[PDB]
Design a protein around this ligand. Structure first.
Ligand SMILES: COc1cc2c(cc1OC)CN(CCc1ccc(NC(=O)c3cc(OC)c(OC)cc3NC(=O)c3cnc4ccccc4c3)cc1)CC2
Ligand SMILES: Nc1ncnc2c1ncn2[C@@H]1O[C@H](COP(=O)(O)OP(=O)(O)OP(=O)(O)O)[C@@H](O)[C@H]1O
Ligand SMILES: Nc1ncnc2c1ncn2[C@@H]1O[C@H](COP(=O)(O)OP(=O)(O)OP(=O)(O)O)[C@@H](O)[C@H]1O
Ligand SMILES: CC(C)CCC[C@@H](C)[C@H]1CC[C@H]2[C@@H]3CC=C4C[C@@H](O)CC[C@]4(C)[C@H]3CC[C@]12C
Ligand SMILES: CC(C)CCC[C@@H](C)[C@H]1CC[C@H]2[C@@H]3CC=C4C[C@@H](O)CC[C@]4(C)[C@H]3CC[C@]12C
Lengths: 569, 569
């Protein structure tokens, strides 16, 4: 089997969370234990290479050789809080893990067989076709979600398996079942390493090695059955009916003292034996397209499975379209035509911009999962980015524009030509994409959403002021005019105006015989446009669209760089 | 001491969470134990009268007499999740509790002495002058927050003290310290009643009575020390090094069975003895002004202590004011004057309306605390409502209007008279108050905020469309025009227009010699107003303000009725 032998570890983050730690984790159900403040999860990550190598200051050595570069890929790790996708079926999650982790050369049949074997081992065949739990509804119980995570890691038939708090939040019976399962797995020769919180003695009866850590020091390392003898030799005695694990924790808590216990251990025989043994010992798979395909499939399944956001979006869009069609129904080429036309176009543009502050949740929600799967070697960050965009951002931002136009354009009696119709659709879509892209660039690489939302709203108000309606941009001062070139709504609104007002007459019965509209009348659309600053040449419309495209590219690239320079360790 | 003797309890919510429960809770450290699904907190609330009496179907009797009407006031209850105010100092929270609970007749000196005694008993004198923990920063540790809650309840020197999960989320040492404190309190003759989750044997060694509940049935009731003997007599045996509490939970879990255990208990000697004993036994302070003063003081201290919301509000308001002053600087009486003036007024109005969707959090956040203190008899709901409004809603909604006007009115070159200036200020304030009041009426009596926020935004968009700028209300159809009378921004915007445009000329160099402005020019403000539907008489402005006031009153009354008919039990 595998023999993971740490030695003289010291990790500096210059607070030193772990001071001096040596041991050997032979095959079996090895364990790590101690108070919450003690560096147990930290040590676990150190052994699994999930922590920045800079602070590390010791020699980790497996089976007599230094850790291979591909270690994380050939050794599983199970996070504390399950990251499985509730909106998917158990077998679907295992299938995703199998498809990306296992080699491409293998056939789909072999991978399906392996998945069946794993489900059989973990006893999940009952729920192999059930939802894993949206947490709005729970297709499976907590224990089965945990077993599913363990299965995802087990797909590649790992030799070394790390776990963090495998029994936390579970009921006593569920925890016992999980740990008995781990004991069965270890009997096969698989080295299991894990951390726990105040285990029961039925659980503690099953261990093969113990590692007790407090304030970053090694109180004990050796066979669990003999830990009680060691402490009793130290003088501390355990009354019956008291769980020995709690007894160790009491001894640590003093119910300073901790350094005294460390000194005792260094004087111990176990330490000498372990040190002698240590000195004796010292003596991507897949292509880009495949990753993109699979992550996009998973994202779309989640998108469908969670109907709240999508369905609410479509319904609100339709209702707004119908209401606006009723209110602005039958626009007239009279004194009030200009007001209503500009108003509706402004409203549509702002609705597209302000309805995209819900894109912050795209990457904020799935930060932990992305980090875990990137470290574990599932996929690159490029494939995650493009697949997630192509599955979530593209369709649900393209739809509202189509709904709005199809509903309003004919109820409102806007221009009857088709070239104008599709320009309206394209312009609204580009506004939505650019706004959502900006939201991504602002929200990417963040775990808190509120700050991002506030920032987006503030930015959008300051953009809205510089839209043509409220301010008459020709009037703004020169030292402030240049900010108008940073506004998405300005480009969209200007394009829509240039599409609609051109070739419209708003002075009925002028008769042009006196030929005097007083020069204060705004009797034509061209005149209104030039008075608002717009350009009547065909270049104006297309330059607005061009600017929107450039903003899209800029913001998406920023988001990618923010993900690629995120702290993943 | 006190002797709380329940008997033949049965509670129906017609799922019957509690089936049949009898016992006697003599003075000391009585306890309630069992699985999470078991009705332990439910039984606790039943005994403390925190549950609707309708479902209850048994006789609760204290010291031989039925529960007095003023029981909740003379018996403390400690909620699971601490409700203390982080933004206050420990002694301040205890002072608030002392001021409202203790009688008015007492002097302040006596109440201060009592507070000092309580702090001395609980050993909080060290942190008597420290912040209780915003959870952005923690002035005190979790154990001290818990001790503070217990002190708030202890102020009135209660005879009967109920607790719920006093050790959940605490560390082992902290939990032991808390329970040892409770043991010290009980040694003085105070009946303590509480519920716990998987206690340690060091804790379990301290009890005086035990009540084991599973699936709403009484597995055991008697001395804790003898529970192990009872179960061993039943046949189930406990291996050493196993916590007896976990042993009982295992027996319940089967590691149906539960009904079998209930049958055993009914056959037991303890049940017969308890039944015989039971049959033998059966054989506002303060004035309104005081409550208002104290709750308002606490609310203002919290408002100051948490600077995020307030300071961000002021800063954003100032920045917007300066930006708008720069952009619209020097309004001119030319063709573009009308556009810019209407735009800025519309923007200010909408900013006041849309910045008030942050008032939903006023009562949403503090629902649990309000319910707890109302049941416990601290204050009426009227005083809470008025004090909370008078402390939070009034000043922070009045300030932005003043900032906006003082900043913009002179940079923009609006009307130079003062009567107009103060009308602008008053109108903006009333808009803010009415909008916040509507948000309260929508959010009061809710624990989820997101739905309220979405509703508020939707309402405000539909209000905005019917503002005069985008739609030319004179044009809307008759069967839809009547909705314009439900819009706050319409009233505010109309009032501002009527204040500004009156007596303004927007056609420079007309010379009035030809006297022909083409009738399409809008050469005067009065003409613009009449074309938009407004009335030039003085009544229009004041009727808009009147409507806003009526909306304020309506919505506030609705909020009060929603709080007064909330489910507090
Ligand atoms: C610290 O400082 C501040 C903090 C906060 C606020 C204000 C502050 O300081 C002031 C107010 N927060 C409100 C959060 C929020 C989010 C989304 C919306 N929903 C739309 O905004 C909208 C949606 C449309 O369709 C869905 C639409 O279609 C036409 C037009 C829309 N909005 C406008 O037109 C408009 C105009 N002015 C505004 C001024 C301030 C805030 C929002 C404004 C919105 C509204 C409010 C919360 C925190
Ligand atoms: N990246 C980091 N930066 C600063 N301090 C850290 C970092 N990682 C760990 N620490 C410190 O190391 C100590 C050990 O924390 P540890 O990881 O053991 O938490 P834990 O509660 O034991 O984990 P678990 O959630 O499994 O119980 C903590 O006091 C923590 O402040
Ligand atoms: N108001 C209510 N309406 C419907 N069911 C209720 C209500 N109150 C309690 N119950 C039911 O009673 C059962 C007992 O819940 P209980 O109050 O014991 O929760 P608990 O987890 O034991 O409390 P704690 O948070 O202290 O652990 C639950 O199954 C719950 O569904
Ligand atoms: C880092 C962030 C702010 C990106 C900001 C990029 C903005 C300011 C840039 C991106 C592309 C740019 C546009 C590219 C093309 C043209 C056509 C030209 O004849 C007028 C300016 C105009 C319309 C530019 C305005 C400024 C612009 C929109
Ligand atoms: C229950 C909720 C919706 C409260 C809604 C109340 C609204 C619709 C009511 C409250 C007071 C009312 C106003 C009372 C007085 C006047 C003066 C009158 O010459 C024109 C109508 C006008 C301006 C009313 C319009 C409708 C109004 C604003």
């Amino acid at each position: 089997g595998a023999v993971l032998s740490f030695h003289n570890i010291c990790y500096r983050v210059e607070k030193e969370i772990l001071s001096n730690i040596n041991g050997i984790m032979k095959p079996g159900l090895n364990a790590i234990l101690g108070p919450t403040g003690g560096g147990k999860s930290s040590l676990l990550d150190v052994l699994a290479a999930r922590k920045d190598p800079s602070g590390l200051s010791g020699d980790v050595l497996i089976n007599g050789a230094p850790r291979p570069a591909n270690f994380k890929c050939n050794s599983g790790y199970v996070v504390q809080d399950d990251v499985v996708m509730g909106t998917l079926t158990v077998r679907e999650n295992l299938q995703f893990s199998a498809a990306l982790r296992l080699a491409t050369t293998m056939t789909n049949h072999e991978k399906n067989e392996r998945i069946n074997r794993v489900i059989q081992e973990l006893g999940l065949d009952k729920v192999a076709d059930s939802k894993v739990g949206t947490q709005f509804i729970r297709g499976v119980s907590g224990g089965e979600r945990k077993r599913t995570s363990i299965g995802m890691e087990l797909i590649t038939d790992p030799s070394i398996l790390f776990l963090d708090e495998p029994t936390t939040g579970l009921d006593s019976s569920t925890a016992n079942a999980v740990l008995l399962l781990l004991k069965r797995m270890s009997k096969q020769g698989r080295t299991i390493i894990f951390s726990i919180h105040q285990p029961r003695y039925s659980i503690f009866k099953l261990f093969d090695s113990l590692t007790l850590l407090a304030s970053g020091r090694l109180m004990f390392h050796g066979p669990a059955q003999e830990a009680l003898g060691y402490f009793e030799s130290a003088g501390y005695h355990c009354e019956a009916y008291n769980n020995p694990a709690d007894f160790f924790l009491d001894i640590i808590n003093g119910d300073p003292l901790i350094e005294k216990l460390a000194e005792i251990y260094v004087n111990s025989s176990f330490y000498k034996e372990t040190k002698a043994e240590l000195h004796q010992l010292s003596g991507y798979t897949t292509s880009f397209c495949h990753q993109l395909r699979w992550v996009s499939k998973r994202s779309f399944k989640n998108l469908l499975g969670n109907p709240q956001a999508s369905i609410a979006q479509i319904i609100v869009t339709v209702v707004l379209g119908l209401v606006i069609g009723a209110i602005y129904f039958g626009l007239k080429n009279d004194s009030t035509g200009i007001q209503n036309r500009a108003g509706v176009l402004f409203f549509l543009t702002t609705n597209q911009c302000f309805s995209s502050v819900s894109a912050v949740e795209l990457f904020v929600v799935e930060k932990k999962l992305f980090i875990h799967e990137y470290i574990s070697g599932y996929y690159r960050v490029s494939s995650y980015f493009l697949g997630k965009l192509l599955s979530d951002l593209l369709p649900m931002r393209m739809l509202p524009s189509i709904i709005f136009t199809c509903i309003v354009y004919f109820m409102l009696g806007l221009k009857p030509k088709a070239d104008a119709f599709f320009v309206m659709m394209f312009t609204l879509m580009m506004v939505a994409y650019s706004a959502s892209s900006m939201a991504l660039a602002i929200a990417a690489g963040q775990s808190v959403v509120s700050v991002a939302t506030l920032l987006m709203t503030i930015c959008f108000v300051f953009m809205m002021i510089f839209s043509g309606l409220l301010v008459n941009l020709t009037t703004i001062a020169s030292w402030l005019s240049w900010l108008q070139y940073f506004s998405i709504p300005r480009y969209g609104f200007t394009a829509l105006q240039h599409n609609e007002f051109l070739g419209q007459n708003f002075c009925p019965g002028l008769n042009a015989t006196g030929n005097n509209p007083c020069n204060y009348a705004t009797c034509t659309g061209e005149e209104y446009l030039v008075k608002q600053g717009i350009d009547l040449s065909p270049w104006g419309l297309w330059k607005n669209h061009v600017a929107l495209a450039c903003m899209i590219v800029i913001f998406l690239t920023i988001a990618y760089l923010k993900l690629l320079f995120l702290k993943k360790y």
